Amino acid sequence: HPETLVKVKDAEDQLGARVGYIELDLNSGKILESFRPEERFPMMSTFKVLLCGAVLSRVDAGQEQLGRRIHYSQNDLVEYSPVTEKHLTDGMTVRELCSAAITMSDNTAANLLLTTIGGPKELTAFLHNMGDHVTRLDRWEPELNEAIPNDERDTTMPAAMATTLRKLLTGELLTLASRQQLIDWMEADKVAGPLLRSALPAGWFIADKSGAGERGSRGIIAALGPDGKPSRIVVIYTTGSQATMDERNRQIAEIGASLIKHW
Numbered sequence: 001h002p003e004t005l006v007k008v009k010d011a012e013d014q015l016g017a018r019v020g021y022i023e024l025d026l027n028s029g030k031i032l033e034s035f036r037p038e039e040r041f042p043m044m045s046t047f048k049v050l051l052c053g054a055v056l057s058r059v060d061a062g063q064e065q066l067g068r069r070i071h072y073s074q075n076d077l078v079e080y081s082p083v084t085e086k087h088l089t090d091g092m093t094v095r096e097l098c099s100a101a102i103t104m105s106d107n108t109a110a111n112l113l114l115t116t117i118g119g120p121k122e123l124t125a126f127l128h129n130m131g132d133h134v135t136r137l138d139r140w141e142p143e144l145n146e147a148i149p150n151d152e153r154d155t156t157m158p159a160a161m162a163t164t165l166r167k168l169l170t171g172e173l174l175t176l177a178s179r180q181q182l183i184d185w186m187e188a189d190k191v192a193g194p195l196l197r198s199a200l201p202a203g204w205f206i207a208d209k210s211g212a213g214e215r216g217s218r219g220i221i222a223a224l225g226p227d228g229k230p231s232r233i234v235v236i237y238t239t240g241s242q243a244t245m246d247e248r249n250r251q252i253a254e255i256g257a258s259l260i261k262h263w
């Protein structure tokens with residue numbers, strides 16, 4: 001709704017930064033509303049969903065096991081590794097690393113998973129293969145959150161991220177069992193409470209993933225809908241603000257309230 005676009009512009013004014021926005025119809029693929037759709041923004045932690053999608057496609061091909069366990073060391077630990085740091089001892093299975101990467105944004109768990117699939121170059125190839133010729137992952141955690149102005153490394157476009165999430169989630173790409181598993185992980189998101197979840201009415205469904213990085217970067221990707229079923233895709237990225245975390249979360253949650261209102 002254009003009123004939502006007003007809020008996106010109000011946000012750009014508040015944060016003193018650009019805001020990329022996109023609403024997608026989950027069923028048809030139709031674009032509902034947009035803003036800075038083809039500009040590049042840093043994915044930050046939102047790439048974790050893509051990562052686990054590639055991991056799931058390997059599992060579907062029998063090239064990987066969810067039950068497979070992985071061991072690592074203190075040597076592998078990166079800042080912000082809430083679960084991983086807890087099992088230095090017993091290691092973790094593929095499944096748990098994805099859970100950890102998505103529901104808690106665990107940095108080390110992402111790094112371990114990237115290694116398993118072939119690193120950033122392979123992720124990029126995976127994406128490019130499925131029709132996304134824009135989204136690129138160049139670095140590992142946590143340098144990928146640098147967000148230096150104009151750098152194309154580790155970025156996406158709101159338009160590209162939206163359709164790719166759509167394909168993962170509803171395309172024939174992943175098995176039914178894997179798509180479901182991916183949705184399940186997103187739905188259990190334990191760290192995005194102040195963002196869109198904060199504007200959701202009771203009974204609605206939401207499967208999401210957020211990100212935060214240097215230079216005021218912040219963003220979220222999500223599939224939501226009323227009555228326990230997702231029906232739309234919303235992507236929101238911002239970069240360049242001098243605003244604090246709270247103000248940044250406030251603006252995003254404000255865009256979501258507008259989205260709901262005009263549903």
Ligand SMILES: *[B]([O])([O])[C]([C]C1=[C][C]=[C]C(C([O])=O)=[C]1)[N]C(=O)[C]C1=[C][C]=[C][C]=[C]1
Binds near residue numbers: 107191
């Ligand atoms: B990710 O953005 O690449 C990665 C981990 C992270 C940190 C904070 C919030 C989220 C989120 O809300 O989805 C994801 N980013 C970093 O590791 C940067 C960082 C930022 C702030 C605290 C710790 C790390």
